[PDB]
Amino acid sequence: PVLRSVNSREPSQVIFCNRSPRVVLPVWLNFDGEPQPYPTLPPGTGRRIHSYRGHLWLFRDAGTHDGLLVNQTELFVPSLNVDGQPIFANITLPVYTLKERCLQVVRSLVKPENYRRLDIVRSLYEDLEDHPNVQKDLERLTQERIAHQR
């Protein structure tokens, strides 16, 4: 799998900083490129982490899996600490499209089995049902990865 951590065994001290208004779920892609969840971060809190050089991390809203960014990008990769200097992973919200943002709010209020009782244009029912998914994201980042490598 193109997207996966490397078993470097080279320790890297990282500090997750949840600079977002969401409960953050840090996801670690193991050696087989499989998503593994870790302890969530409450809004505006930070936490020290013992990771390793070459490991991959991504972050999502713990309860909805809405996509989030780390240091402005999709993936975070620990590097060797330079002079005991910890590596920062600043988690923030991305600028969602107005539509995606509205979809989030609606999903957070209406139970899936009720989406279709809403008085909105048909097409939007499917958009609501198609909630963010980490697996699909990986597949997407994978193909985006392949394009950026011609």
């Binding site: 949840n18 600079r19 409450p42």
Partner: peptide
Amino acid sequence: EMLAPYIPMDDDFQLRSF
């Protein structure tokens, strides 16, 4: 042995921006 990430288990801290 494949070493996976782990949490030192310390006191989380507030980010002053909040």
